[PDB]
Amino acid sequence: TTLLNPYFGEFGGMYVPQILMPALNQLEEAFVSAQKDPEFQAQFADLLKNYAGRPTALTKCQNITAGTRTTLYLKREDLLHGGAHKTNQVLGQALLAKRMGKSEIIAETGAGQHGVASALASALLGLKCRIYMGAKDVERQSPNVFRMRLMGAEVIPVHSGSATLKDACNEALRDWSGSYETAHYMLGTAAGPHPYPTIVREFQRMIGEETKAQILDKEGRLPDAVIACVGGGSNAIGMFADFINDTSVGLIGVEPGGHGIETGEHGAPLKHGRVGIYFGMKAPMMQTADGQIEESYSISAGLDFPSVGPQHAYLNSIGRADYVSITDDEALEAFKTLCRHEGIIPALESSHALAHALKMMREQPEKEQLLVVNLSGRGDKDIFTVHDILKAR
Amino acid sequence: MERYENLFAQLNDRREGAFVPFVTLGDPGIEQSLKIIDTLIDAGADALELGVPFSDPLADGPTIQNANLRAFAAGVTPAQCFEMLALIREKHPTIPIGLLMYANLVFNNGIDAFYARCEQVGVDSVLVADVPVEESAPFRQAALRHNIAPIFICPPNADDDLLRQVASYGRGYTYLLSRSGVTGAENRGALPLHHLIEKLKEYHAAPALQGFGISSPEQVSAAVRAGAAGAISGSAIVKIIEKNLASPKQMLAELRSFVSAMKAASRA
Ligand SMILES: O=P(O)(O)OCCNS(=O)(=O)c1ccc(OC(F)(F)F)cc1
Ligand SMILES: *Cc1c(COP(=O)(O)O)cnc(C)c1O
Ligand SMILES: [Cl-]
Ligand SMILES: [Cl-]
Ligand SMILES: [Cl-]
Ligand SMILES: [Cl-]
Ligand SMILES: [Cl-]
Ligand SMILES: [Cl-]
Ligand SMILES: [Cs+]
Ligand SMILES: [Cs+]
Ligand SMILES: [Cs+]
Numbered sequence: 236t237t238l239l240n241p242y243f244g245e246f247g248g249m250y251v252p253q254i255l256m257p258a259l260n261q262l263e264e265a266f267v268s269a270q271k272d273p274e275f276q277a278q279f280a281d282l283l284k285n286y287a288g289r290p291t292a293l294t295k296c297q298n299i300t301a302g303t304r305t306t307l308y309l310k311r312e313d314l315l316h317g318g319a320h321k322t323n324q325v326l327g328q329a330l331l332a333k334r335m336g337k338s339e340i341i342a343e344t345g346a347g348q349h350g351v352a353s354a355l356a357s358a359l360l361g362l363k364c365r366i367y368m369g370a371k372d373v374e375r376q377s378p379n380v381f382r383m384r385l386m387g388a389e390v391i392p393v394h395s396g397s398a399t400l401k402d403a404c405n406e407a408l409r410d411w412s413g414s415y416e417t418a419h420y421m422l423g424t425a426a427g428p429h430p431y432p433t434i435v436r437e438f439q440r441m442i443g444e445e446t447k448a449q450i451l452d453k454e455g456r457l458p459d460a461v462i463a464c465v466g467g468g469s470n471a472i473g474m475f476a477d478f479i480n481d482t483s484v485g486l487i488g489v490e491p492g493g494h495g496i497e498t499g500e501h502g503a504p505l506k507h508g509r510v511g512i513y514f515g516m517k518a519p520m521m522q523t524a525d526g527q528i529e530e531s532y533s534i535s536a537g538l539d540f541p542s543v544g545p546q547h548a549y550l551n552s553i554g555r556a557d558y559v560s561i562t563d564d565e566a567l568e569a570f571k572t573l574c575r576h577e578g579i580i581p582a583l584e585s586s587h588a589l590a591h592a593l594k595m596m597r598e599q600p601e602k603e604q605l606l607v608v609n610l611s612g613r614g615d616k617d618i619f620t621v622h623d624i625l626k627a628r
Numbered sequence: 629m630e631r632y633e634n635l636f637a638q639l640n641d642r643r644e645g646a647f648v649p650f651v652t653l654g655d656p657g658i659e660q661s662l663k664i665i666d667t668l669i670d671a672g673a674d675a676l677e678l679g680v681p682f683s684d685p686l687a688d689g690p691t692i693q694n695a696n697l698r699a700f701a702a703g704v705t706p707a708q709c710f711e712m713l714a715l716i717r718e719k720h721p722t723i724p725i726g727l728l729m730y731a732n733l734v735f736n737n738g739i740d741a742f743y744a745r746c747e748q749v750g751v752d753s754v755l756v757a758d759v760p761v762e763e764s765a766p767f768r769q770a771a772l773r774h775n776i777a778p779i780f781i782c783p784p785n786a787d788d789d790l791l792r793q794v795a796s797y798g799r800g801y802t803y804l805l806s807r808s809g810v811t812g813a814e815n816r817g818a819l820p821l822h823h824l825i826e827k828l829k830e831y832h833a834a835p836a837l838q839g840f841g842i843s844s845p846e847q848v849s850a851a852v853r854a855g856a857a858g859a860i861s862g863s864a865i866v867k868i869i870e871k872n873l874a875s876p877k878q879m880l881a882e883l884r885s886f887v888s889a890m891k892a893a894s895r896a
């Protein structure tokens with residue numbers, strides 16, 4: 236029994252051990268209550284404004300589109316405190332934890348950005364934070380690991396399975412299954428068991444709300460399309476949500492194509508995986524023929540979640556949103572192009588969304604189109620990755 | 629078939645509890661796993677719980693995480709597990725065989741097809757660890773269509789609605805969780821809540837087996853005295869495998885000694 240629908244069509248659900256069902260029910264109740272509570276809303280809005288720096292800018296990128304009939308705006312989540320959109324929903328989830336009377340936070344992280352966001356929210360709001368991170372990720376993400384530790388979080392390496400994000404996800408749930416009486420699991424994307432896909436969407440929806448207000452102000456009309464990269468689906472659903480009922484607005488999600496779909500070395504389960512049940516949900520995922528869960532590959536460390544939020548799978552199924560992929564090489568070119576032509580260093584994650592927008596423009600340069608790309612994060616973290624690639628060129 | 633019903637009737641006749649070990653199929657290899665299982669049976673196991681290696685066993689603590697990893701190191705696949713299961717049944721016609729599954733392995737090639745394969749190899753029950761009663765409908769329906777008992781979990785804090793659901797929907801046995809958290813011998817659970825055992829009987833549930841953290845004879849005895857039909861032990865068994873990887877002979881000897889002791893604790 237639930238207050239809200241745990242499914243988006245066939246996708247989603249609450250595939251957790253029985254022991255965790257009261258924790259999910261408790262969280263759903265707290266969320267539904269919070270959503271109706273003007274005081275909760277005001278506290279959340281206050282943190283977003285005065286701590287995180289909302290609203291974020293909407294930047295018109297004229298140099299990139301010169302000589303075409305594309306108008307391109309970037310929604311500047313790269314300017315949010317922490318350098319990525321993840322900060323929005325961790326502040327909301329931290330406030331839910333407090334609402335439920337919890338003083339401890341568990342979080343998973345792959346490339347480290349969600350861990351950092353969880354750690355900063357926990358430092359601000361007086362919560363004890365423990366972060367699970369696959370040991371291979373710990374090894375390759377020393378900057379983010381150090382940031383988490385500076386902000387007082389305990390970072391716990393996970394050595395089981397593939398020692399990457401999925402293994403950290405499992406470990407977070409194992410911990411929660413024994414600790415839910417005192418700890419809240421601050422899940423890092425719009426995926427996992429209900430109510431998390433719903434909560435994360437609602438705590439990211441200011442992205443699209445602001446974009447709508449800003450584009451109306453500047454252009455006097457809605458965008459022709461909004462474009463966002465899709466790791467687990469949080470930044471994309473945050474951009475899409477307020478436009479879902481505006482049927483003229485295209486919603487385009489960009490999964491990582493890695494070395495190319497045909498190589499199998501990618502992270503595009505929505506369009507190129509197979510529906511499975513894992514991490515509490517029924518959703519497309521990266522899996523072997525036998526049903527063992529596999530990793531997602533991308534040049535961008537942050538698009539490593541091996542499944543996708545169930546609401547994206549649903550929006551795809553009904554044809555409301557379209558999903559495409561962008562290769563490592565395409566993302567790298569978009570990264571370089573933005574740096575050089577606009578003076579903005581984008582996250583390699585976000586560069587996937589930009590790459591697709593650039594393709595829309597370049598393929599059909601006389602097509603009149605007003606596009607918004609969600610610039611989910613800044614790319615300071617990626618400059619050596621890009622250096623080492625261009626050093627071998 | 630009616631293997632659990634028959635077992636419980638026979639144990640009842642003898643005022644006896646069930647002792648049910650868990651191991652991971654194919655840990656530490658197929659041939660050794662088969663010998664392990666034959667040893668468990670010879671030493672007095674009343675039924676078996678058998679894990680199919682899964683990449684992401686999110687209800688399992690380190691001991692069983694490591695068992696899954698050892699099976700994978702030996703190249704163990706679900707197909708090979710079904711081959712093992714068929715042979716186990718061919719050797720041992722009456723012992724109840726339960727699988728511990730994760731949802732993706734059941735859903736992968738189709739839920740109905742999974743349960744049909746279980747029936748073909750002579751499995752008696754399936755416990756899907758990450759499917760709560762709320763999500764159970766297609767699993768329990770397929771189970772019953774193929775003469776497989778779907779096993780449900782009764783947590784310590786189960787309310788009346790959940791007890792009634794577990795009682796109605798389950799078959800074979802009811803899994804009585806000793807505590808919250810994940811599998812592991814390092815974390816002892818509670819005495820079976822007498823209230824829970826009594827409500828399950830009131831609601832005509834399948835007989836209860838207590839599991840999680842059962843590592844000692846005293847706990848087996850206590851479970852049965854509290855009114856459970858028996859007890860399941862996994863990590864304590866798997867630890868003997870882990871400890872004795874370098875000596876298959878000592879491994880079997882210690883498994884035999886341990887199972888013998890645990891089964892003795894279940895006797896009147
Ligand atoms: O002795 P321990 O502590 O290792 O426990 C043995 C457990 N082995 S099992 O197959 O019964 C078993 C039963 C239920 C499980 O998860 C669930 F409750 F969520 F469904 C996991 C394993
Ligand atoms: C983590 C991350 C993503 C991918 O996660 P989603 O939940 O799909 O948004 C995208 N962009 C940046 C900058 C990230 O850090
Ligand atoms: Cl041009
Ligand atoms: Cl592997
Ligand atoms: Cl496909
Ligand atoms: Cl098109
Ligand atoms: Cl009813
Ligand atoms: Cl001993
Ligand atoms: Cs233009
Ligand atoms: Cs459009
Ligand atoms: Cs994805």
Ligand SMILES: [Cs+]
Pocket residue numbers: 849892893894895896
């Ligand atoms: Cs006894």
